[PDB]
Amino acid sequence: SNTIGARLNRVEDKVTQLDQRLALITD
Amino acid sequence: NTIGARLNRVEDKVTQLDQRLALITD
Amino acid sequence: NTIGARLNRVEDKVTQLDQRLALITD
Secondary structure, three states: OOOHHHHHHHHHHHHHHHHHHHHHHOO | OOHHHHHHHHHHHHHHHHHHHHHHOO | OOHHHHHHHHHHHHHHHHHHHHHHOO
16 A cells, blocks of 8 residues: 555545645636 | 556646646735 | 655645645635
8 A cells, every 4th residue: 555556546536636626716 | 547657647737736726826 | 756756746745735725625
């Protein structure tokens, strides 16, 4: 669960979530 | 996609997010 | 830099964006 690839999965999901929050803030 | 491709992808997306937030605040 | 360093950096940038955005919206 701590390889580059595993940690990449988690950061990808968080980025997706942040992109959605930012959509509520601006274009 | 491959780990290499996905790492480039996220790095550039994070930059994009930062640029979009910056246009509004900071 | 190395793949590990790049991932550490992107994680770092994401934490920072997360905290800023969390002040603005849930």
